[PDB]
Enzyme design. Structure first.
Site, mmCIF file in Angstrom:
data_model
loop_
_atom_site.group_PDB
_atom_site.id
_atom_site.type_symbol
_atom_site.label_atom_id
_atom_site.label_comp_id
_atom_site.label_asym_id
_atom_site.label_seq_id
_atom_site.Cartn_x
_atom_site.Cartn_y
_atom_site.Cartn_z
ATOM 1 N N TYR A 38 69.224 -47.006 132.715
ATOM 2 C CA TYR A 38 69.431 -45.490 132.452
ATOM 3 C C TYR A 38 71.062 -45.601 132.280
ATOM 4 O O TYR A 38 71.504 -45.622 132.784
ATOM 5 C CB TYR A 38 68.589 -44.490 133.127
ATOM 6 C CG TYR A 38 68.895 -44.606 134.304
ATOM 7 C CD1 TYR A 38 68.611 -45.263 135.510
ATOM 8 C CD2 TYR A 38 70.223 -43.026 134.945
ATOM 9 C CE1 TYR A 38 69.380 -44.848 136.623
ATOM 10 C CE2 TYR A 38 70.655 -42.624 135.878
ATOM 11 C CZ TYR A 38 70.298 -43.594 136.918
ATOM 12 O OH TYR A 38 70.958 -43.334 138.011
ATOM 13 N N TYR B 118 74.813 -49.489 139.665
ATOM 14 C CA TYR B 118 75.205 -48.674 139.605
ATOM 15 C C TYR B 118 76.629 -47.853 138.732
ATOM 16 O O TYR B 118 77.703 -49.617 139.612
ATOM 17 C CB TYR B 118 75.286 -47.717 140.639
ATOM 18 C CG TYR B 118 75.348 -46.033 140.409
ATOM 19 C CD1 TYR B 118 74.022 -45.175 140.730
ATOM 20 C CD2 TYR B 118 76.505 -45.744 141.001
ATOM 21 C CE1 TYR B 118 73.973 -43.782 140.429
ATOM 22 C CE2 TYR B 118 76.662 -44.046 140.932
ATOM 23 C CZ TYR B 118 75.413 -42.965 140.438
ATOM 24 O OH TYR B 118 75.492 -42.095 140.626
ATOM 25 N N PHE C 80 76.863 -37.450 134.823
ATOM 26 C CA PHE C 80 77.068 -38.824 134.649
ATOM 27 C C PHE C 80 76.603 -40.067 135.791
ATOM 28 O O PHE C 80 76.772 -40.312 136.603
ATOM 29 C CB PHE C 80 78.847 -39.359 134.300
ATOM 30 C CG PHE C 80 78.856 -40.936 134.148
ATOM 31 C CD1 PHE C 80 78.884 -42.190 134.878
ATOM 32 C CD2 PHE C 80 79.163 -41.135 132.760
ATOM 33 C CE1 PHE C 80 79.193 -43.340 134.753
ATOM 34 C CE2 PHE C 80 79.072 -42.341 132.294
ATOM 35 C CZ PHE C 80 79.312 -43.281 133.068
ATOM 36 N N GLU C 81 75.627 -40.688 135.334
ATOM 37 C CA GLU C 81 75.651 -42.332 135.628
ATOM 38 C C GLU C 81 74.836 -43.268 134.890
ATOM 39 O O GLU C 81 74.280 -42.631 134.265
ATOM 40 C CB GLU C 81 74.162 -41.867 136.442
ATOM 41 C CG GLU C 81 74.000 -40.755 138.007
ATOM 42 C CD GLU C 81 73.656 -40.931 138.786
ATOM 43 O OE1 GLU C 81 73.465 -40.864 140.194
ATOM 44 O OE2 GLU C 81 71.923 -41.219 138.619
ATOM 45 N N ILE C 82 75.091 -44.877 136.060
ATOM 46 C CA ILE C 82 74.393 -45.516 135.093
ATOM 47 C C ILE C 82 73.385 -46.812 135.357
ATOM 48 O O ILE C 82 74.572 -46.959 136.844
ATOM 49 C CB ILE C 82 75.226 -46.478 133.671
ATOM 50 C CG1 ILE C 82 75.856 -45.813 132.829
ATOM 51 C CG2 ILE C 82 75.212 -47.339 133.132
ATOM 52 C CD1 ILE C 82 77.181 -45.723 131.627
#
Ligand code: GDP
Ligand code: MN
Ligand code: NA
Ligand code: NA
Length: 365
Positions: free
Chosen positions: A169, A197, A262-264
């Site tokens: 995500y 992450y 913000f996160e991947i």
């Protein structure tokens, strides 16, 4: 060079973002020699989505954000958007959002059981502690919904049925900016390197929001001694060398966190035994409601104790702003941000940057 500046900690001495900033090493998946067509059944897309917990009333700010993310990245790769809300989305929301992307948009409601406070939380105790935090905390008046949001991001988003067949995500919030063209598939960058992450900004938190978080974390660890990873971030999590009064006020935790707006990320990390047991422990402890435990410190501690630190990545090349902080790299792919300027506002904001500790204790990879 990337060490702390003192005048009193005063932010970074020399920001690595000033260095010529390019793409990561190794193989990168490009839009120009793959099938990333938005409606192709045989595309180069992995099982990933852009996701956003957002309200109907934030539509205009969401649209600004979508325009940036699409222009800089998703117009080439066409990953789907999945929107989440505790309430139903309006027809205006659906029309306006789908108009900003060629990719498929999905509109999901958070189930009551993932949003309502759990049965064991006493709402009178909630209201009493909320009144105290309201009185103490700068530019802050408590809302139950904020606590529900933090809990949802901490333990529930990765259990939503809509995400069951997804592994990665990219979390997006309304009213954020993206400044730099990104010319590789960030999701497959993560997947090919088994990354857990990705972050852009690393900050101190308000110790008043998390006073028993670290004590509760230590209790969890004492009950589960096999869970701590070998390549852990204990040095960063327990640092007191920059702002020792934060670490004391938060009872052993530095308060430093990846800035989770913000996160991947790898959903299967958070679904895993270790992290999810940690979340449930915190959920039963009550601090999502009796305190204001952010999903950022909770994610950061979970990653720092249970992930491989080598699998956490600073996306230095993704130019980013959520008010009032920035990740602006020195690259000709960027525009409209000042490289290495951490903050916009009063100079006392400079000390909120925790990267000098993170880069010392963990690294810049
Ligand atoms: N659907 C929904 N989204 C929320 C609620 N509270 C916060 N959010 C969202 O959760 C994220 C964080 O909230 P925000 O107001 O930006 O908090 P901040 O970034 O910490 O100031 C944003 O994406 C918001 O749109 C809520 O009650 N319902
Ligand atoms: Mn926000
Ligand atoms: Na192509
Ligand atoms: Na206040």
């Amino acid at each position: 060079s990337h060490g702390p500046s003192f005048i009193e900690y005063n932010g970074m001495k020399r920001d690595p973002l000033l260095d010529p900033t390019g793409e990561p090493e190794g193989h990168l998946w490009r839009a120009d020699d793959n099938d990333y067509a938005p409606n192709s059944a045989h595309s180069a897309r992995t099982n990933a989505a852009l996701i956003s917990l957002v309200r109907n009333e934030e539509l205009e700010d969401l649209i600004s954000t979508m325009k940036d993310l699409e222009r800089t990245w998703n117009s080439k790769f066409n990953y789907p958007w999945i929107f989440f809300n505790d309430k139903p989305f309006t027809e205006e929301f659906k029309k306006r959002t789908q108009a900003e992307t060629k990719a498929k948009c999905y509109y999901e409601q958070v189930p009551k059981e993932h949003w309502d406070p759990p049965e064991w939380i006493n709402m009178e105790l909630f209201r009493e502690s909320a009144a105290i935090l309201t009185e103490q905390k700068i530019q802050y008046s408590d809302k139950l919904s904020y606590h529900q949001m933090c809990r949802w991001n901490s333990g529930m988003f990765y259990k939503h049925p809509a995400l069951k067949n997804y592994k990665y995500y990219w979390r997006v919030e309304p009213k954020v900016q993206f400044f730099c063209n990104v010319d590789y598939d960030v999701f497959r960058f993560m997947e090919d390197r088994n990354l857990t992450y990705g972050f852009t900004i690393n900050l101190f938190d308000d110790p008043k929001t998390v006073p028993t978080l670290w004590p509760e974390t230590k209790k969890f660890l004492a009950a589960n001694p096999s869970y701590l990873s070998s390549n852990n971030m204990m040095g960063w999590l327990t640092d007191d060398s920059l702002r020792p009064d934060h670490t004391e006020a938060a009872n052993g935790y530095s308060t430093c966190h990846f800035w989770s707006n913000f996160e991947i990320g790898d959903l299967d990390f958070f679904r895993g035994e270790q992290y999810d047991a940690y979340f449930n422990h915190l959920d039963r402890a009550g601090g999502f409601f009796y305190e204001r435990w952010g999903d950022a410190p909770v994610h950061s501690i979970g990653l720092g104790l249970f992930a491989d630190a080598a699998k956490v990545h600073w996306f230095r090349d993704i130019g980013y702003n959520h008010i009032p902080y920035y990740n602006c790299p020195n690259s000709p792919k960027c525009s409209k941000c000042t490289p290495g300027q951490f903050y916009a506002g009063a100079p006392f904001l400079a000390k909120e940057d925790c990267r000098p500790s993170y880069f010392k204790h963990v690294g810049m990879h």
